[model samples]
Target: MDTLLILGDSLSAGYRMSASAAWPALLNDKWQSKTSVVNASISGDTSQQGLARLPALLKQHQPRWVLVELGGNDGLRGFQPQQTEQTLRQILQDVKAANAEPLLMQIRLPANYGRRYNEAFSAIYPKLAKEFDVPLLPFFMEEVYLKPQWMQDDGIHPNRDAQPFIADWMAKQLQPL
Candidate 1:
């Protein structure tokens, strides 16, 4: 079976939910024995932190695919887009060097983050995708955001009820991989 390593932040880490309720865990359940899903995601992580931890993870899991779900925290913290982009670029490079197909997940920030900064931060995903020729997965929250009940009180993290939906949507996205 192939292995998939998830290097991400709270968005992939299940935030305020149980570990078994996270989308990555649910995705693992969906795949059963077909794919070993190793979720190395942590809450409140930025691209720089993800980059720092990736080498150890790559050596440990040696995954066939690495899903990068970082940068949201960076944007939330108002970090410069260029700095996040540089960190993510290095992450992609390291994943390539480890022989794993990197999937760059597009991260979207709240509109309150300021129009100019949000636009620049949002553009980083596609730009990196084009540069590295990797698959750019849309943020799963896009669909969840439409349903008010699926979101947490904070309006950022998805509540527990949204896990299965996210897993199913993510499964379809991984189907063509």
Candidate 2:
């Protein structure tokens, strides 16, 4: 069976929600027989932290695919886009070195963060994708963000009710992979 290692932050960690209610877990349930989903996501993790944890995770799971969903915390904290990009680049390098397909996920920041910073940050994913030749997954929250009920009180993380939808959407995204 194929194994997918999810290296991400709270957006994929379920945040305040239960572990079973997270999209990765739901995806695991859906792909139980065919693939194993190992979620290494943690709340408040930045790209640097994800990179730090990558070696250990790669050694442990040796996944067929590694979904990189970091950078949200970096953006939220107003870190330089170049720094995040470099760290993410290293992550992709490490994943490739480990013989795992690296999948990059685009992360979006709130409008309040200003046009300059947001645009720069938004461009990082595609740039890396083109450079690394990896699949860039669309930010699922783009759909959820339109509905207030689907978001948590922080208006950032998706609420528990949005898990199944995210799981189904993620499943569709992974279909071509």
Candidate 3:
């Protein structure tokens, strides 16, 4: 089966929901028989941890495409944008070196992070996507975040009902990849 691998953090991991309620799982069901979607995501994982773990996932899945969904935790912890950028840049190259297309996803941070830092953090994905000539998906939770009813009590994770919405968006984006 063709493989689509996602290396991400809590947002993609379905923090408080069942594994089957995660967006990746929804995508797998929606794309059944077409591709095997492997989501190597973890709650509270930072970009550094993802970078450290990436090679093994790449080796294991040998995906046709690799979506990088990390960095929010780094941003939350006040890591420099350059650090996140450097890690992601290396990840993109590493994915390509392994013969898979490297994709990116914007990670939205909370506004309490302050203007300059927030902008810098939000800017990382698109900048890297352009620099690496890779596909970049907008923050998957963009629409969901504005709707309180669709989010969890923590306001960071989306509720189970929002998974299909994100899965459909992911499916469309992956269509042309």
Candidate 4:
């Protein structure tokens, strides 16, 4: 069976939710026995941290495909855009060297922040995707953002109910992979 590596921050860890409710687990369920998952998602992680942890963690699974959703905390804590971009570049380069295809997952910050900052942050994901010639998942929240009830109490990560929405989208992406 092929393995899908889910590398991300708290959002992908399914914080405050059961393992079965995490999007990676949900995607594994959708694939049934045909596929497995190695979830290396840590809460409160920044891009640099995620990049540092990712290589060693991924070595164990040697995943066929990788879904990278990082940099949220970096943006929240006010890290520089260039720093985030550099970490992401290193991550993608290493993953490609591992012979694992990467799927870039984009995230948008709250619009209340200055427009310039938000645009720079939001542009990183797609920019990397295009540069690396990888499949871009567009936005992590996507349709789930429209469904207010699908968010957790923190209003950041999605609720358990949003797993299907997330998994379905993931399945679609993985299908082409």
* Candidate with the greatest lDDT versus the true structure: 2
User: Can you tell me which runs of candidate 1 are displaced by over 4 Å?
Assistant: none
lDDT of each: 0.91, 0.93, 0.87, 0.83
The C-alpha stretches of model 2 lying farther than 4 A from their native spots are none
- Per-residue lDDT tens digits for candidate 2, residues 1-177, read 999999999888999876777999999999989999999998889999999999999999989999999999999999999999999999999999999999999998965668988999999999999999999999998999888878898878999988989999999999899
Report the error of model 4 at residue 140, Å: 3.3
Least well predicted 10-residue stretch by lDDT in candidate 4: 137-146
For candidate 1, list the clashing residue pairs, or say none.
Answer: none
The RMSD (Cα, Å) of candidate 2 is 0.8
Could you tell me how far off, in angstroms, the CA of residue 127 lies in candidate 4 after the best superposition? Answer: 1.7
lDDT preference between candidates 1 and 2, better one: 2
lDDT against true structure, model 2: 0.93
Tens-digit per-residue lDDT, 129-169, candidate 4: 99999988867575776788887766677888887888788
Cα TM-score per model: 0.97, 0.98, 0.94, 0.92
Per-prediction CA RMSD (Å) = 0.9, 0.8, 1.3, 1.5
Positional deviation of residue 153's Cα in model 2 after best superposition, in angstroms: 1.4
lDDT of 1 by residue, 64-112 (tens): 9999999999999889999999999999999999999999999998645
Which 10-residue span in candidate 3 carries the lowest summed lDDT? 105-114
